[PDB]
C-alpha cells in the first residue's frame, strides 16, 4: 500500500461495519492517533471534517485525500457506498507514506480497501439487518430556562410590554390578539378555543417536543463472496435509511450495490474491477445554525412557553401564534407538507485494472475509472395554502452532473542485486479530471396542486432566469518511489514526484516534491530474540508534499455579466486575480518508534513530527476599499509540532475468556509563523478569533470581570493595565480596544481515544471512547438566553430573575437593560469525552447448526453516543468550531441487530 518507513495506522472491518449513521468517518473519531474527526451537526446528511496532525492551512483545505481501491473518491460519494464492504481503512500520516498520492497529500491520505473474494470451495453468503432509533443526546439546556409565568412577569417588570401594565393586562392582550388573528382564517375561526389553544399561560408548551422527535434508522445487507482458481469475487446489495431527529426533515437513504471481481487470466495477466453504485436520497435541515424565531434548538429554548404549537390532541397544530404577527406561523410538519423536497442521486463508480507481469520483478499496472453522479431534486411551494403569503404555488427542478475520471499507470521492478541486498523501483503516471454541472429552472403562479408542470407556470412578470453552474479541474502527475533492503534490518526508501493542476496558471501550476525514509529493525539486528521484547523499529521521514485544495478558478482577473437593462448586456469586474498563484508547499519531519512486547501481546508506537507550511494559500481578506472580499495568495507560513502515541494489549486471555483494550493520543501545537504583508496579527472580524505570529489560531475578545456590585454594570479588565496592589483595572465602558488574545486555541490540541473489549464464551462487550481536549467555543445561543437588555420577547435563563437591583445587589447577574458583549463569559470549554460505541454481541454457538444451510448467527444490542462528558452549557460541545450557533446537536442511538451466515 505504501512504505515501511512510513507513519501508518490501519483500522479493520470491525470498527467500520454497520454503524447507524451514513457518516463513515465518524466511526473513526478517537480511533487513529493524530487524526481528529469531528461532526458539527447531527443532521444525517452532514459529513465529518478530518484533520491529520493539526491544520495545515489557513485558507486551503485540511481535508485528507480519500481513496477507495486506488480511486480518489469524495466523501459524498463514499457516503453512497455500503461500509460493510470495507475490509479496512488505512490512515497515511507522514510524507514517506503519502508518496504515490498527490493533489493534497500534505493533509494525509485515508485509503479504503473494499472486501475481496476468499477462494473457497463453498462461497460465503452473509446477511445483516438492524433497526434502531436516534434521539437528542442532551436536554440539559432546557432545565434552567424560564417557565411561562416567570417569563411573562420578567418581561412586564422589565418594561417590555409598556410601562403602565400588569401581568393580567398583557395576557388579555396576547389572548385577544391570537383570537383576532385566528378568526381571520376559515380554517381557524371555529377551531380557536375548541381545538387550538395557541396562547396558554396555565401550562408550558414543550418546545423540545414541538421541534424534535425520535427517528428510526434501519439498514440491511446481503453479501456474496468466494472464488476459485485465480478468479475472485465479492458482491453485495444493501439498504440504508437514517431519519433526522429534528422535525425539520432531514434524512439519508441509500440503495447500494457492489461487485468486486478479479481473475488471473493467464501467466502474465491479472485483471479486475471494483464496481459499485447507489440510488441515494439525501435531505438537509437548512435552518440550523441561523437564528430564526421558533426554529431549531434555538427556538427550543427561546420560544415563550405560553405559546403552544399543539392541538388538544398533542399532535402539532399546523400553525402557531406570537403576539403582533399578522399571519400565523407554520409548524415544522406542516411547513414540510407545504415545502416538499426530494432528491434522487444515481451514483455509478466503474473501474478496472490490468496487471501485466512480463518478466520477473516487472509489474505493469494500468488502472482507470469514472465516478458518475446524476442528481435530480424537486422542490415545491404548495398552492392554495391559507397560511402562505400567496395562494399561487411554485416549483423548482434541478439536474446535477458530476463526472470525475482517473487513470493511474505504474511500472514496478522488483530485483535483488544479491541475497543480502534488495531493490524495488516504481514509476507512475496519474491523470485525474473532474467536470461538474448543475442546471435549475423554476415556475410559479400555480393555482392547483394537480397542475404543476414547470411548463404550466404563469408567463410575463412571473418568469425567471434558470440556474446554471459549471466547474472543471484536472491533475497531471508523474511519480516515482524506490525501496532498498540491506540485510533484514535497515530499509531506506525515497520518492520524487511532479504535480500540475488546473487551479493555477500555466507558468505556476507545476511543482516537484520528494521524500526520504528510513526504517531500522533494532530488535532483529541488535537484540536477536529475547524475553519480554518482541519488536523494536526506528522510523524517520523527511519530505515535501503539495496542497492545492482551493477553488477552481482563483488566479484569473475576471469579468462577468451584470446587466443594467433588459435590452443590452452589462459587464462588471468579478475577481481581483493573482497570476503567481501556485502550490502550497508542506514539509514534514517524522520520527517514529514501534515496539511489541511479551510476544506482541502488548503493541505500542509513538511518533514525533514537525509539519511546516510555506507559500501558504491564504484566501487573504482584503480591505473593503478594494471592492473585493478576498484573493488567494501564497503568503503565509505555519507550523504543526506534535506527538501521537498508541498502545494495544491483551489484558486477560483464558481458554474461555478474552479481554483486550487499546488507546491512542495526539498532542499538536499549532504556530502561525508568517501571515501577510509583514503583519504580526490579523483578527478575523466578528469571529472572536485572531491570527498572530508565534501562536495558534486563538480566540480574541475582552475579558469579562463580573459586575460592579453597586451599579449592576458589566465590567471588563483593561488588558495590559494595572493599579496599586489591588491590581487588574476594570471598566464599565465597553470598547473593542479591550479585546485581547486569549490563550485558548481555536483548533483543539488534544485528540485521542480508547477502546475496551471482553469476550466470554460467545458473549462480547465492546466500548469505544473518543475525546477532544482543549476545545473552546463561543456559545452564541447564550447571547440571547442570558440577554437582559435586548431580545426581550425571547425566553431567557432563570438567572435573569436574579438580576441586579438597588434592592438586590448581592448578585452577579447584571442589571437588566444592557446588551452582553462577545467576551470571555460566552467562551465555553467544549472539551468532551464521548462513548462513541457500545456493542453487546452474542455469537450463537456452533452447536446449533449441526443442518446443512445456516452456518452461524449473531445478535447484538448497540448504542452510539450513549455517554457524553463535558462542561459545555449548550446542547452539543462538538456541534461547532469557534462558535456554537443554533446547533443541530449530534444524536444518540439505540440499535438491535442480527447477522446470518451461510
Amino acid at each position: 500500500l505504501s512504505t515501511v518507513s512510513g507513519s501508518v495506522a490501519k483500522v479493520s472491518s470491525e470498527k467500520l461495519a454497520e454503524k447507524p449513521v451514513a457518516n463513515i468517518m465518524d466511526a473513526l473519531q478517537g480511533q487513529v492517533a493524530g487524526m481528529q474527526v469531528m461532526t458539527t451537526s447531527g443532521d444525517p446528511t452532514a459529513v465529518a471534517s478530518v484533520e491529520i496532525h493539526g491544520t495545515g492551512s489557513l485558507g486551503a483545505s485540511s481535508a485528507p485525500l480519500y481513496i477507495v481501491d486506488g480511486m480518489q473518491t469524495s466523501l459524498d460519494v463514499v457516503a453512497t457506498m455500503n461500509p460493510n464492504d470495507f475490509e479496512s481503512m488505512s490512515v497515511l500520516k507522514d510524507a514517506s507514506a503519502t508518496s504515490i498520492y498527490g493533489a493534497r497529500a500534505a493533509n494525509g491520505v485515508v485509503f479504503i480497501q473494499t472486501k475481496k473474494g476468499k477462494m473457497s470451495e463453498r462461497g460465503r453468503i452473509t446477511f445483516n439487518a438492524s433497526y434502531g432509533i436516534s434521539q437528542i443526546l442532551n436536554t440539559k439546556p432546557l432545565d434552567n430556562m424560564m417557565t411561562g409565568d416567570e417569563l411573562l412577569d420578567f418581561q412586564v417588570k422589565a418594561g417590555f410590554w409598556g410601562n403602565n401594565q400588569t401581568v393580567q393586562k398583557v395576557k388579555d392582550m396576547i389572548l385577544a390578539g391570537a383570537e383576532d388573528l385566528y378568526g381571520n382564517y376559515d380554517s381557524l375561526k371555529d377551531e380557536y378555543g375548541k381545538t387550538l389553544f395557541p396562547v396558554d399561560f396555565n401550562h408550558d408548551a414543550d418546545w423540545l417536543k414541538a421541534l424534535f422527535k425520535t427517528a428510526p434508522t434501519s439498514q440491511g445487507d446481503i453479501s456474496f463472496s468466494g472464488g476459485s482458481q485465480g478468479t475472485s469475487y465479492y458482491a453485495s446489495i444493501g439498504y440504508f435509511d437514517q431519519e433526522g431527529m429534528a422535525r425539520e426533515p432531514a434524512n439519508f437513504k441509500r440503495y447500494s450495490g457492489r461487485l468486486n471481481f478479479e481473475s488471473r487470466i493467464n501467466e502474465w495477466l491479472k485483471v479486475g474491477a471494483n464496481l459499485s453504485g447507489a440510488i441515494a436520497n439525501r435531505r438537509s435541515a437548512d435552518y440550523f445554525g441561523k437564528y430564526y424565531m421558533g426554529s431549531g434548538t434555538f427556538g427550543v429554548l427561546t420560544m415563550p412557553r405560553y405559546y403552544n404549537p399543539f392541538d388538544v390532541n398533542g399532535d402539532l397544530a399546523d400553525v402557531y401564534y406570537m403576539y403582533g404577527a399578522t399571519r400565523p406561523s407554520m409548524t415544522e410538519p406542516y411547513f414540510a407538507k407545504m415545502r416538499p423536497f426530494s432528491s434522487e442521486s444515481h451514483q455509478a463508480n466503474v473501474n478496472g485494472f490490468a496487471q501485466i507481469t512480463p518478466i520477473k520483478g516487472l509489474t505493469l499496472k494500468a488502472q482507470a475509472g469514472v465516478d458518475i453522479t446524476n442528481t435530480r431534486t424537486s422542490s415545491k411551494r404548495m398552492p392554495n395554502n391559507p397560511y402562505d403569503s400567496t395562494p399561487l404555488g411554485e416549483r423548482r427542478e434541478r439536474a446535477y452532473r458530476d463526472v470525475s475520471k482517473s487513470f493511474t499507470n505504474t511500472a514496478e521492478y522488483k530485483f535483488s542485486i544479491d541475497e543480502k541486498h534488495d531493490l524495488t523501483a516504481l514509476m507512475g503516471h496519474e491523470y485525474i479530471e473532474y467536470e461538474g454541472d448543475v442546471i435549475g429552472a423554476s415556475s410559479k403562479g400555480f393555482e392547483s396542486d394537480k397542475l404543476m408542470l414547470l411548463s404550466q407556470g404563469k408567463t410575463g412578470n412571473s418568469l425567471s432566469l434558470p440556474e446554471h453552474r459549471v466547474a472543471e479541474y484536472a491533475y497531471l502527475s508523474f511519480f516515482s518511489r524506490f525501496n532498498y533492503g540491506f540485510d533484514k534490518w535497515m530499509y531506506i526508501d525515497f520518492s520524487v514526484r511532479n504535480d500540475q493542476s488546473s487551479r493555477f496558471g500555466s507558468n505556476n501550476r507545476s511543482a516537484w516534491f520528494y521524500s526520504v525514509g528510513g526504517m531500522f529493525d533494532i530488535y532483529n539486528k541488535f537484540i536477536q530474540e529475547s524475553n519480554w521484547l518482541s519488536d523494536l523499529r526506528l522510523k524517520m521521514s523527511y519530505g515535501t508534499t503539495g496542497n492545492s485544495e482551493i477553488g477552481n478558478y482563483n488566479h484569473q482577473a475576471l469579468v462577468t455579466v451584470n446587466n443594467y437593462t433588459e435590452d443590452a448586456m452589462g459587464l462588471s469586474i468579478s475577481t481581483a486575480g493573482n497570476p503567481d498563484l501556485s502550490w502550497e508547499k508542506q514539509s514534514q519531519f517524522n520520527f517514529g518508534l514501534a515496539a511489541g512486547a511479551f510476544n506482541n501481546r502488548l503493541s505500542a508506537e509513538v511518533d514525533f513530527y514537525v509539519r511546516t507550511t510555506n507559500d501558504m494559500l491564504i484566501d487573504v481578506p482584503m480591505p473593503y476599499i478594494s471592492g473585493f472580499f478576498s484573493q488567494y495568495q501564497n503568503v503565509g507560513s505555519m507550523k504543526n509540532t506534535g506527538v501521537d502515541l498508541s498502545l494495544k494489549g491483551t489484558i486477560y486471555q483464558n481458554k474461555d475468556w478474552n479481554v483486550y483494550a487499546s488507546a491512542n493520543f495526539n498532542y499538536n501545537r499549532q504556530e502561525i509563523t508568517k501571515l501577510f504583508f509583514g503583519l504580526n496579527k490579523y483578527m478575523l472580524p466578528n469571529t472572536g478569533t485572531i491570527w498572530e505570529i508565534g501562536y495558534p489560531n486563538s480566540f480574541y475578545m475582552a475579558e469579562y470581570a463580573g459586575i460592579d456590585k453597586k451599579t449592576g454594570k458589566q465590567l471588563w479588565y483593561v488588558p495590559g493595565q494595572v493599579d496599586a496592589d489591588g491590581n487588574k483595572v476594570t471598566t464599565s465602558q465597553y470598547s473593542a480596544d479591550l479585546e485581547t488574545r486569549i490563550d485558548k486555541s481555536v483548533t483543539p490540541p488534544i485528540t485521542g481515544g480508547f477502546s475496551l473489549g471482553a469476550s466470554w464464551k460467545g458473549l462480547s462487550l465492546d466500548a469505544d471512547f473518543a475525546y477532544i481536549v482543549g476545545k473552546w467555543m463561543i456559545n452564541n445561543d447564550r447571547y440571547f438566553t442570558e440577554n437582559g437588555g435586548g431580545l426581550m420577547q425571547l425566553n431567557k435563563d432563570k438567572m435573569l430573575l436574579n438580576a441586579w437591583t438597588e434592592d438586590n445587589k448581592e448578585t452577579d447577574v447584571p442589571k437588566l437593560g444592557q446588551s452582553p458583549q462577545f467576551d470571555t463569559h460566552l467562551l465555553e470549554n467544549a472539551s468532551f469525552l464521548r462513548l462513541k460505541n457500545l456493542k453487546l454481541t452474542y455469537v450463537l454457538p456452533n452447536s446449533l447448526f449441526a443442518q446443512n444451510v445456516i452456518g452461524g448467527a449473531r445478535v447484538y444490542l448497540m448504542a452510539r453516543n450513549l455517554l457524553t462528558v463535558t462542561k459545555y452549557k449548550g446542547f452539543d460541545p462538538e456541534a461547532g468550531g469557534n462558535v456554537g450557533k443554533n446547533q443541530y446537536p449530534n444524536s444518540k442511538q439505540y440499535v438491535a441487530g442480527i447477522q446470518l451466515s451461510f
Partner: protein
C-alpha cells in the same frame, strides 16, 4: 495534455478596444449603483435618528441604530459572499462602486488616448460616459464621507481623525491598502470630479436611468448643503429645481398612484432600471410589510415617535403614503414610503412589495434651496418654494422660517436617511428618552431607553470604520476615541 480551465460564464479583464465593450462596462457600473445608492442601504442611518422607537417585534436588527447600542454599532454589518448588509455593507458597496468606477474611468480614458474608437460620434459618447463615471466616483466617495468622516461640530474624537476624510483610492488598484486622505483632499476630489462632469454632460437629460447634468447639479447641491456652503448649494439648486414639476394630485390616493410609480412620477431626476424581473427589490425594513393574498399586512420592528406623526397635518398626502395608519390594523403609523411600485408585481392581483432605486427626486432640490435661501437672506425664494412644495402635497405651510423648513424637510424625506444628518446640522441632540410613543400602539410599540445618550457633537453620529478595514490596514486611523 492541456491543464488550462477557465470558468464558463466569465471573461478576462481587457482594456477597452471597442465602443460596444465600453457601453457594456458602463451598464455593469449602473447595475452596481442600483444596489449601492439603494434605500435598503440608507435605512440604518434613517433609524439612528430621533424619529423611531423599536417594537416588541424587532429581533435586535433595528434596536442598535434606534437605541444607540454602540457595542453593536462599532463593528456592525457584513460584506461577504453571503450577505452585504449594515454599516460594513454600506461601506463596502460604495467602495466597490468606487473601485469599479475607477476602472471604467481609467479604461475609457486609455481608450480615448489609444484612439480605439471608430468615428467622431463614438468618441463624444465615450467622453460622456467618462463624465458619468466621474459623478459616480464623486457619489461613492461622498457617501463614504457622509457616514465615515466627522463634521465640524464633533467634540471628543480619536486623536487626529477630526479632519480626516476617507481612504481615497483614485485608480483601479485591488491590492491598495493606504491611509485616510484628509477631509480637504476628499471633498476637493469629489467636487472636481463633479465639476468636470458638468462641463461635458449635455444640458438636457438623455435618460432618467443614467447620470445627467441635472443629477450632477442636484448631487452637488446636496453635498454643498451638507457642507454648509449655502450660497453654492442654492446656486446649483436653481439650475435644476424648475426642470422637474412637482406631483400634481387632488387627493392622497392620487398622490400615491403617481408617487409610488417610478415611471410616471415626474419628480424623479435619476432612478435605476427596475422591472418585475430585473432591478426591483423589497425594502420592508421600515414598514414590515407582507403580502396576504390580495392585501398587505404589516408587522413593523420600528415605528415613528408620536411627534413625527404630529409633524403631518391630517390632510397632508404624505400622511397616507410616506407614513400610513396601518399598525395594528389601523391604530398607529409606520413609515410606508417604500411600500411598492405596483408595476413590479408578478401578478397584478397580488402585492409583492417591490420598489426601485431612486437616486434624486426634485422635492429634495426644493428643500435644499429653501434652507440655503433662508440661510442667505433670500426669503422670497425660500417662501416661494416651501409654499410651493408644501401646497402641492396637500398642506401648504403657513410660515416660512427655517423652523418650518426643518418641519417640512423632515416631513418630505422620512425614510430616506436624511434626518440624522439634519440633526447634526441643526444642532439637535437625540431626545429619544423624552419622546412619547404612539398611544394607540401601547403593548406593541413601547419605550426603550438609549443604551448611550447622543448629545450635540457626540462622536457616534459618525460610524467607525469597519473592523475588516481596521484589522487589515495599520495605516488606518480610527474614528472613535
Amino acid at each position: 495534455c492541456e491543464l488550462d480551465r477557465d470558468p464558463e460564464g466569465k471573461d478576462f479583464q481587457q482594456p477597452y478596444t471597442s465602443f460596444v465593450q465600453t457601453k457594456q462596462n458602463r451598464d455593469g457600473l449602473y447595475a452596481l449603483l442600483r444596489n449601492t445608492e439603494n434605500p435598503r442601504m440608507h435605512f440604518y442611518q434613517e433609524l439612528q435618528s430621533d424619529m423611531y422607537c423599536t417594537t416588541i417585534t424587532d429581533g435586535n436588527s433595528l434596536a442598535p441604530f434606534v437605541n444607540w447600542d454602540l457595542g453593536i454599532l462599532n463593528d456592525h454589518g457584513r460584506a461577504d459572499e453571503d450577505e452585504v448588509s449594515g454599516i460594513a455593507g454600506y461601506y463596502f458597496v460604495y467602495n466597490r462602486l468606487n473601485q469599479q468606477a475607477n476602472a471604467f474611468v481609467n479604461n475609457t480614458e486609455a481608450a480615448l488616448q489609444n484612439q480605439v474608437y471608430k468615428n467622431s460620434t463614438e468618441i463624444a459618447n465615450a467622453k460622456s460616459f467618462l463624465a458619468e463615471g466621474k459623478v459616480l466616483q464623486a457619489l461613492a466617495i461622498w457617501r463614504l464621507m457622509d457616514r465615515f468622516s466627522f463634521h465640524e461640530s464633533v467634540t471628543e474624537v480619536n486623536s487626529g481623525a477630526k479632519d480626516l476624510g476617507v481612504i481615497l483610492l483614485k485608480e483601479y488598484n485591488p491590492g491598495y491598502i493606504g491611509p485616510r486622505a484628509t477631509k480637504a483632499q476628499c471633498y476637493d476630489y469629489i467636487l472636481s470630479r463633479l465639476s468636470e462632469a458638468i462641463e461635458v454632460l449635455p444640458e438636457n437629460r438623455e435618460s432618467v436611468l443614467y447620470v445627467s447634468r441635472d443629477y450632477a447639479y442636484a448631487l452637488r447641491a446636496r453635498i454643498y448643503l451638507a457642507l454648509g456652503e449655502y450660497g453654492k448649494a442654492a446656486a446649483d439648486a436653481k439650475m435644476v429645481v424648475d426642470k422637474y414639476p412637482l406631483i400634481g394630485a387632488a387627493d392622497a390616493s392620487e398622490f400615491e398612484n403617481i408617487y409610488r410609480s417610478d415611471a410616471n412620477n415626474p419628480e424623479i431626476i435619476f432612478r435605476g432600471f427596475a422591472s418585475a424581473t430585473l432591478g426591483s427589490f423589497t425594502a420592508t425594513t421600515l414598514n414590515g410589510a407582507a403580502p396576504a393574498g390580495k392585501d398587505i399586512k404589516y408587522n413593523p420592528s420600528a415605528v415613528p415617535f408620536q411627534w413625527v406623526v404630529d409633524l403631518y397635518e391630517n390632510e397632508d398626502f404624505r400622511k397616507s403614503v410616506y407614513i400610513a395608519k396601518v399598525v395594528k390594523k389601523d391604530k398607529g403609523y409606520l413609515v410606508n414610503k417604500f411600500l411598492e411600485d405596483k408595476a413590479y408585481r408578478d401578478v397584478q392581483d397580488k402585492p409583492n412589495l417591490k420598489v426601485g432605486a431612486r437616486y434624486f427626486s426634485v422635492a429634495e432640490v426644493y428643500l435644499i434651496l429653501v434652507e440655503s435661501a433662508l440661510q442667505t437672506g433670500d426669503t422670497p425664494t425660500a417662501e416661494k418654494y416651501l409654499k410651493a412644495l408644501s401646497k402641492a402635497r396637500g398642506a401648504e405651510v403657513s410660515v416660512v422660517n427655517m423652523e418650518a423648513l426643518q418641519a417640512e424637510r423632515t416631513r418630505e424625506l422620512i425614510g430616506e436617511g436624511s434626518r440624522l444628518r439634519d440633526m447634526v446640522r441643526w444642532s439637535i441632540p437625540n431626545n429619544h428618552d423624552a419622546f412619547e410613543t404612539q398611544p394607540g400602539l401601547e403593548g406593541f410599540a413601547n419605550t426603550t431607553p438609549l443604551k448611550a445618550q447622543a448629545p450635540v457633537g457626540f462622536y457616534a453620529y459618525t460610524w467607525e470604520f469597519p473592523q475588516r478595514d481596521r484589522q487589515t490596514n495599520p495605516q488606518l486611523i480610527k474614528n472613535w476615541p
